[model samples]
Structures are given as C-alpha cells and as structure tokens.
Target: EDYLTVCPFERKIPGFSMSRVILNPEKYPLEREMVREKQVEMRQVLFCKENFSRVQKVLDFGCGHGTDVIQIAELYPHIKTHGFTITKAQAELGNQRIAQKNLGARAKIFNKDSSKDAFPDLYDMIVGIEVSFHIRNKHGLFQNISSSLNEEGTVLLIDYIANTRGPIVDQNVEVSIPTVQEWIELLAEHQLVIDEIIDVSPQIANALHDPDVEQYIKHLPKAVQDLYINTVNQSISLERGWISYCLFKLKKAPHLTYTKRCEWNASKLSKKRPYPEALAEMINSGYIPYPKQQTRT
Candidate 1:
C-alpha cells in the first residue's frame, strides 16, 4: 500500500522524476501528478507554440520508461515520437506504457545506446533530460546527434555543469562534468550552436527541500532510497553554488552549397573560356550534389 502511494499505478518509474521542478512548492507541493506537470512544462520549452507544426519527428534520447514519449504522443497526435534507452527492461516498460495509452502507431521505445548505436532515422527535434552527463563519450554523442538531425532540427538538453575549473566528483554518481566554457566549445566543435541557456539550480534545490519529497522517499527500496539521498546531497551542492543545472537550446548549423560559389564567379569564368555545359547545368538548376567548403571569390 505504501509503495502504491509513493509510486502510483500510472507511473512505473521509481524514486523522484529525473527532471527539474518549475512550479512554486508553497502552492504546488511535489507529488506523483506534479511529475507529469513538470514534464509537460519541459515539452512547452522544447516545442513552444510557434514550432509545433514544423516538428514532425521527435526523439527522446535516454527516455526512462517512456513517460515523456507517451505524453508527447498523446498531446500532439499529428507528430511521431520515438525514444531510446540503453536497457531492454526500460524499453519494454516504456513500450508497454505506450501501448496502454493507444499511441503504438506514433510512439515507441527502442533499447539502443545513444553513445554506440546509430539513430534509426533523422529527427526534427531531440530532447535529453538529465541524461547526457551519464554518457562518458560526450564527443561521440554530440557527433551522432549532429549527423542524425534534419537540416532544420533543434535539440533541448537539461544537465549538470561544473562551476569550478577543476573536476567535481560525487561518491554516489560518476559524471564527467564540463565547465561552461568547455561545454560551449565542445558543442561548437560538433556544429551545434547554443541559442540560449538558463541556469535553474535555485529552483531545483528548492524543489528538493519540499516536505512531500521526503515523505515519498521514506517508503522506496534501499537502492532507490540511496539514489534520492544522493540527489538531495546534490541539491545541497546546487544551493551552495558548486554546480549548475542548465537548460540548453541548440540548433544545427546550415550546410554550405557549392552552387552559390559558382554563381559569384561564373561570369568571369565564361569570359576566360567557354563555360562547360555540365557546369552550366549545375548552376542553372541550383542543385548541389554535395556540400562544399565556403569559397572566397
């Protein structure tokens, strides 16, 4: 009975939700339903109102139990949503939830590691919730994310970043936390530009102090109990300004086309020699078979 109260039948995941809280605790104390409400807020941040129609394919990298995937599919029936989790158990549970919601046609959870496996297809948007820090090969992760994105794709990530120049290590959690500067350069290296970033440490720290959170944690298993305790310790660090909880908004850089270069100097080339018909066809059609480096005239 206690377990059922802590983890409602509708929510299968254990412990607290792996997401930040947005609402004020005084008015809306943390609860099982509050988890879904916070997740809905994340969806609003990811898609906003203006960009929903443009997004047709969305992927939730490291989706735990497919709660976010089912929510997305149910809210926007027009778009197709997919999720990837490293463990088969998580994927199975997530798919089960999707089936129960009658979103099997538009939503699915695959047991695939984001660091090693290739994405099944291109996506218009990708979201990662407190998951990137778990993967050690962030370079490979960002590289694959860049290659798998559509030209007009966007990425939304919420994760931890180091506040000090040196590394910060937690006894319970192993993370390769990057400094803000390091994060900016690393993302730029993969052609993902950061459009905006919001530091949400204060809000998360406050949410962790909610009395309801402590009450719910009292009944979880030891393993799960330890995780929440660790999380609470991390929240203390967050309050102390030792680390930052950030929301990153990023977009892929546009690829340069070769035909544009020819247009600039084509007149000069014609005067110098007879313009090749093959080359002319390329210019007239404005069709570039492959992307090329930016050339100066």
Candidate 2:
C-alpha cells in the first residue's frame, strides 16, 4: 500500500542530495540514529523551531522527488508545501509520495521550470537545496522567486557557490556558479537581501562519505548511475576549496522603512570646479570668538 515502494524513503538522490554522512562529533554535536535522521536535522536547522509559525505556505523551487515537500507537509500540519521540477519523472514520483501520505491536499509537485513558468501562489518561504547553482538563468529564476514570494517571505538556499579565487571547473556538473559576493548582489537586485550566510563545506565534505549514499547510488540504473556519478564529482570539487557549500537566508528587502543617507548626495555641487566663497565661509567660519562666561560667586 506504500507508494514509496518504487522510490523508497531511504534512497538518497545524487548530486545535491541533502541526506547521509554524519559530521564529526565536534561538528555534528548530536548523534542521528540513521542516515535519514540527518535530513531531519538539517530541516530543523534550516527551518528552525520558531520559523514554523511564520511560514504557512512553502515552496521548494527545485524539489527533487518532492521528498522535502512531503517531509515538510508531514512535519508541520499548518503548512502547505509545493514543489517544481523540470522533469516529469521526478514530479510524478514526488506526487505519488504525497498521495501515499494522504498529503495530496497540502502538497504537490509540478513539472515546470521557475525560469519560464509562473507559480500558483505566493509562498511565505521558498527553499532551493543545492539546486540554485544548476539554474542557467539565475536572474530570471530569482525574479520569478521574488515575484512569487510574499512581502514578508523568506528564501533559504543551500548551494555550492563559486569562490573569488576562482573554482576548479571541469569536475563539476553543468555551468559554474556565482561567487559569494555576486550571489549577494544578484539577490539584492531581485529585492531579496541576504540576512544570514553560513559556509558549510566542511560538513558537506563529511556528508559526502556516507555509506548509505554510496549503497543507494549502487542500486540506480546504469544511465542514472552515470548521471549521479557526475554529481558526486561535483561535490568532490569541494575538497580543493574550489567552491563552498553555503547556506543563505534571504528575505524581501524592506523598501518602505529603509532610509538612505550618504555624504555623496551633494557631491555634484561640490564637484562643480572651485568652491564658492559662501561654501568656503561655511567651512572656515569657526573663527568667530566665543562669548566669555561670567564667573558665579
């Protein structure tokens, strides 16, 4: 009766898969009983305890197999989860899981690309797990995400970002990613200001070694295995500091209450050849004598 029969819950996807290998005792801090528990730990960290109430509608921009979507819907009864993927295969598989869990009412996955298609509703939170970097037209993608987000919404991303020192490119799959600074500027251009950023490459390096992941990968079809191996190579690119595994928390830019104050505002007048006598007088006029204070008895 389990729709997850075809794609069991235990199987981890290749590439940006958010499951498996535990970090060292010093880093992980808590012991997760199973590889699957790592996913829960990550979701809790990303969503946090208090963020749940603030997020009613959530969208996974590049949800793979809708795993996160189903997980989120199941974890928080108050939330409605949606996802979009480019391939029908992934969407169909994800949708099956949604129905299996009887979460069809609150969870769904569509075979659509964010860069080209419109979202059905405004979401309070949009998450892209290691997927944003794969997006070819990030500007268009972000524009869509920004437009689909509510005024008080948030966007959480876990991606492999390019380093300023440049990256070791050929190993990674698809095109390269934006530098950390470029990502910040690019998001700002779309009205999403980054509020928090965490470099998680160290932990990612550890996660890449999970035996569970390797075992699961072995079960995939020949062609699928080839595709997955390429993604694993992309993750391995982390070892040389070629790219960074980072977590980014972005929120809509507060346009209404923000104020701009800069010294350059009046620079045009000051730059007009030489300073006028009145302006010079204002600058040099501290020569006026101060009134003497009378001593009190």
Candidate 3:
C-alpha cells in the first residue's frame, strides 16, 4: 500500500498529485531545489574528501530521477553507482540522464520494488535520501538493506524523524517519521551501530532565509507565497523539534552483548498480577518519605 495516495496536498489542488509534484518539477520548484541543495550538503558532510575516495560500490535507494546518483557518479568517476526507483517515469528519466552523460556503462537505473526481499548484494555504501519516511515497516527495511551490504558497510540515512512525542494530529498526514530514540532502537535491532548524527536544520533554516530565495518567493502570488512560507516554516519547526535532518551514518555491529543481569527470583516475585495491584500498593504506601536522622541523637 502506497501511503503517498493519502497525500493531503494532492486532494487540495486539481491536476496536481504527488507523482506530478515529483516528476514535473515545475509544480514543486521550492521542494525540488531544497532537496537538491540538501543532498549536496549531506554528501559533503557525510562523504568528505578523506573518505569519499574510499567508496567503491554505491546504491542510491529510491533514486528519484537519478539526479543525486548522476551527481555522485560525475564527482566520483571511480565509483560504480546503481539507482533504484519504483516509479517507471522516474527510472526512465534517470536512464535518460545516464545515457546523455554517456555513463550508461558505469551508472544505471532500475525499476526495483523495495517492498519485496530482493536486493543487489555487497554494496560498500547505501544512501536513502528522504526515502525512509515513505517506508511503512522501517525496521524491516533496515534489516533487508543490511543483508545486502558488504562487511563493515555504511548506510547513510537522511530523512525527517518523528518528533519526541508523536505526529501532530492537526497535520492530517500519516508520517512514518520515527523519534531519535526509536531510530536508535530500530538500528540496533538490525545490528547497525550509529556512527554520527549531524543536525543540518540550522543550515537549512539559514538557506530558506536567503535574500535571493526570498526574492523568488516574492514573485509568486501572495497567497501562494504565504502558503509556501507557512508550509516550509512548519517543516523547519518540525525538524528543529526533533534530533536532526541532515545525516546518520551507521555501520553494522560486529556482535551483540547484553550486560544487564536477567535472573528472576521467585522470593522477590508477587503471585498477584502487577498492574492495578501494584498501583494500589504504591498509592497506599504514601510515597514513603525519605528518612531523616539527627546527628545529636
């Protein structure tokens, strides 16, 4: 089930849907530009000069239009890159770009469905740029992707994380964004150790405030501009409300170890079920005020 079908904005605007918004580019000028700029920033932050050369095999999961894949391939010709997308139109556009650059030999695009179990084997690096939020079973996705990586492989995740509390009910959108803690647990469940968490919301917020960008915004109708501003502001606010927006580099853990003692003692256990009875016992105990001793005594 594609959650994109429930996109709120699609219903509001006639002839404008999520597919059109993503494929047409003209309908989502600000969003497309923002994604491109963020991807560049993320690449620089995560794959710096020192380690960028080390990356050999790369997979751009959900490589819509293959813009980022092409950019990376152009920047790092030594690396082999493969982009996978479910959308046929996106994959076609990506293939076209690859052919135009004569990179058909090194870089290729495939219309692959990620929901299933199949995936290419042994990639040095896998990138999911703003794609995880669209996935329903995030933990399952991570587990599946983990199996397709080479030993000591790295996975870079850059997506909107859920807030500490939960989704805002008023938004009317089903966002699968997980909290920072939830992300840590999910990654650990798949034996992926988090290497770094970079907060790029400040940079993004600063970019949104640029004078040139503001000039472009002013050109649009007042209502449209206001709507765009409000929407972006809300998104930025949401990002700030969470841990990060830029990058999370996670490496597969070598092994798992649990340090806590897990022995359950019969002498310490109560036969009664622990819920309401435990609550009653604690309440009747009257908080058990701390002991106060007098030195004079």
Candidate 4:
C-alpha cells in the first residue's frame, strides 16, 4: 500500500482532514467539541502528576499534524520532544505549527514510516494515541518499539481495545482492532510488561452525548448529512464495538528477548494470489498447510 496516498476511505470523501477539524472547532462544531472533551479526559487520565514528572524525553508516535505533541511540549517545556507520522501532509502541518510556535529547536515533527522499524531516538516516554488500531502487525510493531527504547522507557498507549470477546469488525479488512487481552498478549510477546490499564469508556460516552454536540449536529445543512452521518456513526461504532478506549502503560523489561527466526518467518504473502493456488502451493511445499483439514474417510 502507498503510505503517501490518502487512505481509500478518506479518498472516497472529499475535503476531510481530522487536523483541520481539530484546528478549526467552529467549522466542525460537534466533532471538534467531542474530540476536545475526550482529549481533556484522556490527558487527565494518562498524563497524571506521577507520569508527567518521570518523563524527561517524550515521543509522540503517530502524531498526526503534531497537535498533541505541540500541546505536550507547551505544557512541559523542560522535556525534549519529537513527533512522527506517515502522512506527508500531517508532517508538513506539524512542521508549520512548530515554526509558528518558535519551538524549532525544542520540538520537531517528521514523516516516518512505522512499518520499516525506523523510529526516533530512544526516549524516556513514548505515546501512541489512537494509532495502534491502524497497524496490522501488532506484535512486530511492539517488538520494534521495544528495541528502540531506553532501559527505563515507558510506552503510553491510548487506543480502542476490543470488547471482552474481540473486535466485531470484519477481519478481512486491514483495520483489525484487538481485544484488551490480545493487546496485552501482543505486548508480552514483544517482551514488554504492562504496568497499568485504565478503562476510559465513561469519558468517551459522556463526550459523545454532549448537549453542545447534539445541538451543533442538528444545525448542519442537509447536503452534508451523509458525511456527518458516516463520521458520527463511525465514532459511535468505535466506542461501542470495543469495551472502551483504554490507556495502557507499558515498561521495558531488561531481560526481554524475541526470536530472530520469528521475524524471518513472518508472512509476506499478497492478496492477489488465488486461494486454491496458494493452498496448493503451501501443501505441495510440505508445510502442514491444512493441519485442521477434516478426513472424510
């Protein structure tokens, strides 16, 4: 997939930029207000006094447009900060903001591809806010991140974890949300230890039903109803599909290790191949291609 191109879903809808909606709250009143409220709640829960004090260096992983990164830098000027995103437009906007704030020396934003295992320098703290759901290889991502952290490094993850059962969405699609336990297991597989898990569902639920948002949505023009409906539905679905949006704090373990062969054995198959052909290839290669195949004798 072309990381530079706008996502297919985003491409289907014209004039959609989350950064713009975030920056100009007046234009997208309902979305902006809900996002602001949730962000405040998230900050309160995740950026508590104890966590804030211990973080000397911070990395905002998947920091689209660096809004959250810039906000953190503003709040904690003493800390060195960096933000990274895959989108060129997001990076450009973030750089523009950094320049406008005269924080060029203290804070920076760059276009970094997460799948490549090339992350910024090791930091005391790293944050991935609502970004992990977009990643396909959860285990590999955690492993790579674990390798690029300080011994005392802590990873702060605020994302939508699947309900008790797991993600209800179609697994065939690229976006596959995992259960909270699944997330923890993935982290453990990568040799990271979870220090804390906080369920922030009530906060999200409250923001979704905020009276101001309802009023704003009521006033939107009929022409944009489809867009509004889709976005709103997605927001609600995300909240409901998962048990909650959670804050997972993970610490790097000293004795952590992962098998190099696991990396070598990871699948690199493409979807273009026919299912029957692929199955035949695997079977002919003597790879125990159908361990679960039933015998009809």
Candidate 5:
C-alpha cells in the first residue's frame, strides 16, 4: 500500500514538495551520478557547503532512499553511516544504492521512525537534512538526538524557520515552524549549544526552480497537487512569515545553567540591542529582545 504513494519516492529529488535541488556534485560522487552527470542533486549542494568534521559513526534522522547516507559514507569511508526512514520502499531503494556503490559495509538504512524506535549508543554524529522541521515535537526529537550521541557528538542540519508571524504552510505537511529565537531557546532548553546558524536563503530560489523539478511537478496527480506541488505558492511562504532556509550547527553542552520564568521581565531584557545580538548578549546583560522583535540579521 505504501508503495502506491508517489510522494515518498519521486519527491525525494524535487523540493520534497515541488519544494527545491542544488549544486555541489559531492565530496565523493555517487556512482550513477558520476556516469550520467545528468542530475543536480540538492542534498549534494548542501553537503558541499557543510562544515563537516570527522566522526566514526553517523545517523540521518529522516533518511530517504539512502540518497544522503550513501553519499556521506562514500565521502567519509571511515565512517559507518546509518539512516532511518518510515517506509520500506525507501529502505530497499537505499540498500540497492548501497550495493551499487559497494558501500554495503559503510552505509545502511533502517526502516522505522527514529522518534519511536530505540537506537544503539553508537553514533558520534547525527544529521537531519531538511527533516527536523517536519517533526511535530522538535524538543522530543532533540532530546532523542541528545541521548543517542557518543559524547563530543554534534548535529548538522538545515530547516525553514519562521522569521516572523505567518500562517501555517501547506497545512498537510508543515506542522509548525518556530522562530529563530524560539529555536535558540529550544536548543538551550535541551542543553545544546548553537555553534553556528548560517542563513542560506540565497540558494533556495535556484533549488526550487530547477528544470528537473519543474518536469517532475508537471505530472503530479491532481489531488496531490495542492499538497505536494508547491513551488509557485510555497516560495511565498518565505515572504508571509519571514521564513528562510537556515543551516544549524549544534552540539551537546558540557554543562548547563537555568533561571525560573518568574524571575524575568520583558522590560529587563533589552532596549538598546538589535535583534541579532538579543539572545547571545543575554548572558552578560541579563536582557533579551522584546519577544516580537528578536530575529536573525
């Protein structure tokens, strides 16, 4: 029955919604891609730009068809890369690719929801490319990522964040998008430090408007069109809510401190500071940006 669903498969290449693709062939090119040189893989584009560090083991939270996992494993041959997906088709497809690349030893996929399943205490690095935002309970997911790490572990990821108030998009898929400030607090709540947050909105338009993506969008079933084919309508989502693509670099904290909510007041947070400095400046100044005003520059 799940195989009957098209979005889970074809959508892996396009915007994940009519959503998006990119440059960056790869650090280690996948075998077929090397032979054909016909497709622009979106994930490879981001992978090229990643500030990757060495790790012996890695996990991809919402891995689809091993597109990302196999590539990552190919690049870091020393790393045993694993990915989890919710569908059997994606799992089999991933395994097929793994076979083709002879990455069977270094790359593998588990067909299950990581959020509900148990993970061995094995991974040193975890990633969720374009997948974290879809999680309904991000904090719970973050907690899972935290618990599964091998100490000195870090998470590399990207997601759309609300820059300001806006309507829920696509309704069928994007459950909610927290503001960048809210994301910061969420990380601090999980005792995860934000090592970096790079705004990469400049790359979105090209990925979303890819020629291959447009071809893929042309034949979507009429019913799925509203939910899956969203290029024209979805890009507007960015403007409506100040939504933007952001790359996140995070790690578990060595130690954490806290304060009660009752101890703080809005006026005590900040007046002179601009939005970008609002969160970081708090440690030294005992101040925060007015809730609505806090934002990334």
Candidate 6:
C-alpha cells in the first residue's frame, strides 16, 4: 500500500504514495497522484501543446496504473493515447479504470517489453515517468522511441538522479542513479533537443527521519507504517545522495546517419591519373583536407 494510496488495489512495485505536510507544495504535492497530475499539466505548458494540437496522439512510457494516460484522455477526449507498463497487472488495472470510465475508446494500455518492443504507435508527444533510469541501455531506449515520434514530436520526462549509484536495488529502484549532467549527455547523444529542465524535488522532499513521517503514519498498522518508513528512507537517500526529480522537455532531432571508408593515394588506386601529363600531375595532386599517409607504393 506504500506506493499506491487511494487504490491499494493499484499497488505499485515497491511503491508508496507521499506523506508529510509541506508548505506551498508547489504544483504537485509530492504525492503520487498529485505529482503525476502536476506533471501532465506542466507537460502542456512546457512542450506538448506546441508540438501538436489538443487532440493529437500521445505516448506514455512506463505508465503505472495509467493515471497520466487516463487523466489526459479524460481531460481531452479528442486526444488518443497509448501507454505501456513493465507490470502486466498495472496495464490491466489501468485498462479496467479506462473501461469503467468508458474512455476505453480513446485509451489503450500494453504490456511493454522495453528492450525488444517498439513504442506501440507514432506520437506527437511521449512521456516517461521515472522509467528510463531502470532501463540502462539509454542508447537503445532513446533510439527506439525516436523512431516512433513524428517530426514535431516532443518527449516529456521526469525522474530523479543520485550523487552515487547504488547496486541493483531490484525492480522498484533503478540500478544506477545518474546525475543530471549524465542525463544531458544522454539526451544530446540521442539527438534529443532539450527544451527545458525544471528541478521538481528540492522544495517538497521530506527526509526519512523528519518526524513528520511518524506523525503521518500513526493511524496505520505497524506493518503499513514500516512500508511508509521505507519510502521515506528511499526519499531521504535520494535527496541526500543528490537524487532529485526533474522534468525534461525534449524534441527529436532529425534522424542520424554517417560513416565513410576511403582508400587513398586517391589511388595507388588512381595516382593523379594521366601518366603522360607531368610526374607531379601523374602523382597524387594531394587533397586539401585529408591525408591517408599510407606508404602504398
């Protein structure tokens, strides 16, 4: 029940919702639903609105229980949405929620196999909610998603980073907690044009022993209390270790291509041709830029 609150039926993997009162909590209150909802809204303000119209298609990567996907669809029935989850059950629950709301017509969820599967459909906007850190092969992940986005497609990403990486902590916590600088490199390497990056965790994060955690969970069973405690522990470790959340807006750059193998001398292969002209002309005219410098005679 830690990761999921309103619907414990929607238990997240090692997940728990937020606790502790915070002042001004900004747009999102650090609670799962609130944070997610805030993220979706900010996405529009950041890039989604400009990339495509209100009714265009969107992709939700790592959509847990489909809140963001379902939320967007409900807000704008004109928009078509697709998403995938590592947890099969999350997909099913998400679909079930969609069905109950009768929004099934505009929304769909799939059991996404990150490494091998395509991004389901082409999209004008794509969102990844704390998902990429677990899928370490960033090059492959970015490349695959890049293929599924349109010319004007934009990516809305939000997640945290750590000062030092911990060992494989299992499915819930990503293995490597990459720093923000590392994220920039990965985005650049994949040719994603960064539109903006806003630090989202600084103001609202609560530490494990902030005492508020205890106060917040006093009403729950001791076991439930432990779960929340762990969540806070993780949250504290994240902040203490420099792991903080950020929202990133990115657009796909033109697809990349390259590589050339040149055999030089221009030729021992074509030594300046016209053996009759002049010895200099017969020899390599010598290109301005490149010199193979291989002694082939």
Task: Please give the distance, in angstroms, between residue 260's alpha carbon in candidate 5 and its true position after superposition.
Answer: 13
Q: Over 4 Å off in model 4, which ranges?
A: 1-24, 27-38, 49-54, 164-166, 170-173, 210-242, 256-297
For candidate 1, lDDT tens digit of each residue in 71-158? Answer: 6678778889889999898899888888878899999999998988887889988888778877888888888788888988888887
Superposition error at 180 for model 2 (Å) = 2.0
Q: What number of clashing residue pairs does each candidate have, in the order they appear?
A: 0, 0, 0, 0, 4, 6
Collision pairs in model 2: none
Angstrom error at residue 69, model 2: 1.7
Report the CA-based lDDT of candidate 5 relative to the real structure: 0.56
Residue pairs that clash (backbone atoms under 3 angstroms), model 1: none
TM-score of model 1 relative to the true fold?
Answer: 0.69
Error of 1 at 252 (Å): 1.0
Candidate 2: 10-residue stretch with minimal lDDT: 1-10
> Per-residue lDDT for 117-136 in model 3, tens only?
45675688888867777677
Q: Which one is best on TM-score?
A: 1
lDDT of each: 0.62, 0.62, 0.56, 0.58, 0.56, 0.56
User: Candidate 5 has what TM-score?
Assistant: 0.64
Give the true-structure RMSD of model 3. Answer: 18.2
Task: Report the Cα lDDT for residue 132, model 2.
Answer: 71
Candidate number of the best lDDT:
1
**What is the model-wide C-alpha lDDT for candidate 3?**
0.56
What lDDT, from 0 to 1, does candidate 1 have? 0.62
lDDT of 4 by residue, 1-297 (tens): 101111111011233344345334678876554444434434444544234556777787788888657866777777778887989998998899889998887789989866565676778888887777778867667766877778888888776666657554544434567765565557667666666565544534443442244345565666554345534544566456544556666776557554422222122111112222333444465533111222349
TM-scores for all predictions: 0.69, 0.67, 0.63, 0.65, 0.64, 0.63
Positional deviation of 83 in candidate 2, in angstroms?
0.9
Give lDDT: candidate 5, residue 20: 24
lDDT of 6 by residue, 1-297 (tens): 112311111122223324542212344444544444433333333333342334389888788888768877776667888988889899989899999999988999998855468886788878886677768676778877878888877887765555444432444544455554455455656666655555444333421225445576777678767656655655666556556555566766555321111111112212211212221331344321111122338
